[PDB]
Design a protein around this ligand. Structure first.
Ligand SMILES: C[C@@H]1C[C@H]2[C@@H]3CCC4=CC(=O)C=C[C@]4(C)[C@@]3(F)[C@@H](O)C[C@]2(C)[C@@]1(O)C(=O)CO
Lengths: 11, 245
């Protein structure tokens, strides 16, 4: 899981 | 009140600058390094853009991630094609206002091949005389054009969102002066060919990423994305959604 991507997508 | 198309226009990210130091001659390694970092930051913008895109956040989170990871390159490449279109009529590559690559700078050994396929994208805007609104619509459609062979978690939500922006594209065409049918054929044909041309860019990219002996640096954002997306592409487990066969 791309952590930065995910972090962006969940506020 | 408000129209979808004016929402597209308003959520479109401002053009980012590269900070490239051109005091001393271009090295291909360090130009690619600078581009990758510009790239990371543009992807970060793309993520904020997509979150603001009506319908997108109805998708399952994992599906939001997948779409962004699968299409980031075609987004970045298309928007590059747009900046090169309006900025230099597709003559030069306008990566940023402070990083334009003309014929000379391209002659960098490693650069020429990749640069031609990027130039091929802007010439298409020139040839088809794509309007801003047409571009904005085609851009979301790229974000929704590359899916897992196994489909998405939110397939029916997805299918609908795709439909809406397909119709938004119809509207941008009609809005722009009977044969609107032909335009749609060409525009959707342009979207189709992106898969091929973006193919090559993604090839070089995985290459430069995989082959660490090359000294081409990637920011975390891209590295996380590439290293997750690579196995999926190599396993041939992703699929392009085409308008024509
Ligand atoms: C040919 C490829 C494709 C290139 C990308 C093409 C799309 C793009 C447009 C930009 O406005 C800025 C960065 C990117 C997103 C990019 F230009 C850089 O990241 C470098 C890149 C991956 C590449 O030059 C490399 O693989 C070198 O590492």
């Amino acid at each position: 899981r791309p952590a930065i991507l995910y972090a962006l997508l969940s506020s | 009140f408000p129209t979808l198309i004016s929402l597209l226009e308003v959520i479109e990210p401002e053009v980012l600058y590269s900070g490239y130091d051109s005091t001393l001659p271009d090295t291909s390694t360090r130009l690619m390094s600078t581009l990758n970092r510009l790239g990371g930051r543009q992807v970060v913008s793309a993520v904020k853009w997509a979150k603001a895109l009506p319908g997108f956040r109805n998708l399952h989170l994992d599906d939001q991630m997948t779409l962004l990871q699968y299409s980031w390159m075609s987004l970045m490449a298309f928007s590059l094609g747009w900046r090169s279109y309006k900025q230099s009529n597709g003559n030069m590559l306008c990566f940023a206002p402070d990083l334009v690559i003309n014929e000379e700078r391209m002659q960098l050994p490693y650069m020429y091949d990749q640069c031609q396929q990027m130039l091929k994208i802007s010439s298409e805007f020139v040839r088809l005389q794509v309007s801003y609104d047409e571009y904005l619509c085609m851009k979301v459609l790229l974000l929704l054009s590359t899916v897992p062979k196994d489909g998405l978690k939110s397939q029916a939500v997805f299918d609908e969102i795709r439909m809406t922006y397909i119709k938004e594209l119809g509207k941008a065409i009609v809005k722009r002066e009977s044969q609107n049918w032909q335009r749609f054929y060409q525009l959707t044909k342009l979207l189709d060919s992106m898969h091929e041309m973006v193919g090559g860019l993604l090839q070089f990219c995985f290459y430069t990423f995989v082959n660490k002996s090359l000294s081409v640096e990637f920011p975390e954002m891209l590295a996380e994305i590439i290293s997750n997306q690579l196995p999926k592409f190599k396993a041939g487990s992703v699929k392009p959604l085409l308008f024509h066969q």
